[PDB]
Design a binder for this molecule. Sequence first.
Ligand SMILES: CCCCCCCCCCCCC(=O)O[C@@H](COC(=O)CCC)COP(=O)(O)O[C@H]1[C@H](O)[C@@H](O)[C@@H](O)[C@@H](O)[C@@H]1O
Ligand SMILES: CCCCCCCCCCCCC(=O)O[C@@H](COC(=O)CCC)COP(=O)(O)O[C@H]1[C@H](O)[C@@H](O)[C@@H](O)[C@@H](O)[C@@H]1O
Ligand SMILES: CCCCCCCCCCCCCCCC(=O)O[C@H](COC(=O)CCCCCC)COP(=O)(O)OCCN
Ligand SMILES: CCCCCCCCCCCCCCCC(=O)O[C@H](COC(=O)CCCCCC)COP(=O)(O)OCCN
Lengths: 67, 80, 79, 545, 80
Amino acid sequence: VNKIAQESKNIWKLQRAITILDTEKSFLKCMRKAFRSGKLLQVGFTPDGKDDYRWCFRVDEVNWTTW
Amino acid sequence: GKIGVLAYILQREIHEPECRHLSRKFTEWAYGPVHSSLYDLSCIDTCEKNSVLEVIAYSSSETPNRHDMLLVEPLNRLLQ
Amino acid sequence: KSLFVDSYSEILFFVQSLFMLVSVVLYFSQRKEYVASMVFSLAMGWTNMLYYTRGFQQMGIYAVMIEKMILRDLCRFMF
Amino acid sequence: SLKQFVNASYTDSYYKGQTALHIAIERRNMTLVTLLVENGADVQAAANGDFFKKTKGRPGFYFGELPLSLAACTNQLAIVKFLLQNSWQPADISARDSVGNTVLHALVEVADNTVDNTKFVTSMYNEILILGAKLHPTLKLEEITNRKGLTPLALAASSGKIGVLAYILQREIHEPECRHLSRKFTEWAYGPVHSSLYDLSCIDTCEKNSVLEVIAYSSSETPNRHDMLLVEPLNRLLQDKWDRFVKRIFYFNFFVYCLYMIIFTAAAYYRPVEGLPPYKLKNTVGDYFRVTGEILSVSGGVYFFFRGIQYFLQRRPSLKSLFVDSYSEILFFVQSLFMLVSVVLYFSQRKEYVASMVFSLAMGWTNMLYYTRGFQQMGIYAVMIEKMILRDLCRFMFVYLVFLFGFSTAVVTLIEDGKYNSLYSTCLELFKFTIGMGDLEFTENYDFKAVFIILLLAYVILTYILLLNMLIALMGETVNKIAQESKNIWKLQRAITILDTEKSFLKCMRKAFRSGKLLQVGFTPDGKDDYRWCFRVDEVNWTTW
Amino acid sequence: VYLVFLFGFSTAVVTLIEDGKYNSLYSTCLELFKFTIGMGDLEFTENYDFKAVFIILLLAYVILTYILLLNMLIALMGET
Ligand SMILES: CCCCCCCCCCCCC(=O)O[C@@H](COC(=O)CCC)COP(=O)(O)O[C@H]1[C@H](O)[C@@H](O)[C@@H](O)[C@@H](O)[C@@H]1O
Ligand SMILES: CCCCCCCCCCCCC(=O)O[C@@H](COC(=O)CCC)COP(=O)(O)O[C@H]1[C@H](O)[C@@H](O)[C@@H](O)[C@@H](O)[C@@H]1O
Ligand SMILES: CCCCCCCCCCCCCCCC(=O)O[C@H](COC(=O)CCCCCC)COP(=O)(O)OCCN
Ligand SMILES: CCCCCCCCCCCCCCCC(=O)O[C@H](COC(=O)CCCCCC)COP(=O)(O)OCCN
């Protein structure tokens, strides 16, 4: 028990991930709302003149260095 | 199970003209200490065949770092 | 090989169902031995409740620790 | 005209009030700030849109809504100085935002107890205090309260900003015309010895938000509530209060409760066995003692009942904090409830009062462990017992009770037309395995003996061999990780007892106010002399002669 | 701590017991002590009413001393 703390947490998170994937793969209702994170414009300038929307996921961060 | 390369790719940010589009992590806004990042999520959440989440989760148990790979930032936050 | 060293929960739920179906077959075969099958399913049915300790972090990690104790320490001890 | 142009600001409800000065400061552009101030920018424009509020469920950044507070909270000292002491439009250092937070309240709010953040927040706090002294010597910034009535110190204590609190309480400013801003002073120093003095204003006592009351009666969601009492003056001060005043009263309370529990035990032990209560009082010595004991027991029950209600009404826990914290109040209250229900059943002519009474009696004795606080080693031990119950016993009991019930149902299903043949009897019979009394052949009223023995061996291997030994292992892991946490929790418990005894005090005594009123500097900004009720701490240092 | 718990539950049990063989602090104290050494009877008497109350008390004692306190003692010795 002293040596499997982090290993146990990681295995639990993998078990929960498997549960999440199985739930979304079953879904029993043809629901599209399972597709999360929203479709945002990243650069708007690909190599050509087109704009790129890429379904990004937002993560807010705080840092008190590198102003 | 190449966790180093996976960690590199998923949060790749390329700061130069005509190579920004190769990034997978972007900064949308930053006010003061606060700043909001955007992770690409193409071929992570869903794709044709080999989603990163499906490939990790359904790995064959001989993969070296299969338990550790979900700690790579966007994947853990996305699963939560 | 991944069928046994991995996915214990799938095996356990499947084996519970196998005990149930063998119980049904014995029941309509006019054998009292269906009871022997049924109770095994019943016992397994309750221990499989631990599958749902995932979804709660503390109990989930606790259940993983139980699994690892079984597979390592209890096995060596029992030999 | 230019004043309307330069002071143009957003009107939408999200970025409301933001103007070019806010953007100039946010961008760390000194030139733009200077230019905007030159042209009549309003240095008091309040940015009060939803983006500039706490708003835990949305992104944002609270900084106190003012340009001075923005400059301070972004670690830009030069802009802070410029805004405070420019020629065209100096900023109002005492200004308050819509919440009532001044610049110092804002600096406390942006604290988050990381090392770099704590460093810059305390540095900016000190610089702002120095500047306020130089610009407004008669102004006492730290006494300004926000709309909740909290000063920056009380806000730091209630919010769990341990870094800022630790800075404030032992703040020492070595320069002329800013000495009075100190809260730690060095009185005399002979050799390596020197005797420092801590302020104790608004720590030991004040109108509303004493630091000790704020920390001790915190709402259990505060991040560092166990840790904040380790800040130097507070730990020494609580030890002083204990030793001088509270130890004797607490021992007296423990003695009285012990007498009450002895009397209750004696009265309950000699209860009469005739049917149909209440019982006629016999004209003999023993029965007079018995009924006196009954009255005293019920009196104590009513006592604890009303003290529990008083606790609830005074604190008003929000129905989740009511249960996850203050276990001792709940336990003593439940004891009193069992006593009162026993009284009702006694005078309702029901024998069930015995069932109530014994429960109270049992709880009463376990509640004696409440008094293990006030003794160091037993207090730590009781805290560890609490944490073992709350973590490891609870998780084990969930898993164990699932296994017990599952195998009990399997076994009782296999059994047919026997003595046991009931869920209760088989549950108890499998429970006996846990206490090392399992029969393993307790019945034969089945068919398929091999199934019965396989079930029992599986149950024993899963619960007795695996789960109990695993519980011992997990408790061993836990006790290794809660040493310091146990010390801090016990210190908080004793602090709670100290504050409760001082608030009760039963004699209108003023000696509870410790530390003595010393002339600290004798030179405030004006010619008056400052007496501060300081607390003396002697220290010895063999460096820095 | 153990002796506080032992005496408290002993007095509760002997109060609940009425006109029996045990019906005394000494006998009931010893009979609850037998739980500590793995010999607790757990139905050692019936000379009461409210068997639910009796068994609730004994299970509370068993949980608090046998399952909690002794195992906690082993953990503490490991720490020491
Ligand atoms: C008659 C009565 C018989 C009952 C006997 C059994 C009692 C316990 C029953 C508890 C039921 C819990 C459960 O359902 O199984 C537990 C483990 O149970 C055992 O250890 C049985 C040992 C034999 C976890 O199962 P899981 O599939 O999640 O395993 C993880 C994978 O997910 C993941 O991908 C990784 O590969 C990881 O390495 C895997 O571990
Ligand atoms: C039939 C028989 C039933 C008897 C059941 C009960 C047995 C225990 C008997 C032991 C008596 C000890 C006691 O009287 O209570 C103990 C807690 O016992 C339990 O945990 C019972 C769990 C359920 C201390 O309670 P305390 O008020 O100090 O709580 C702390 C706060 O004060 C502090 O501010 C902090 O917020 C901290 O987080 C809190 O923990
Ligand atoms: C870790 C602690 C474990 C506790 C184990 C139980 C012992 C604690 C009992 C203390 C409670 C009060 C004892 C009162 C003594 C008493 O008055 O009981 C006397 C017996 O005297 C003695 O054996 C002295 C016992 C010596 C005490 C050694 C610590 C006779 O009552 P009997 O029912 O036995 O005789 C009835 C015959 N018809
Ligand atoms: C740590 C877990 C250990 C488990 C210990 C065993 C108790 C678990 C029992 C749960 C199963 C459900 C019991 C159903 C109650 C019931 O209906 O049975 C009642 C008895 O009720 C009770 O004593 C309540 C017990 C108090 C509940 C304390 C948790 C009377 O049936 P008898 O066989 O005794 O009498 C028949 C004589 N002709």
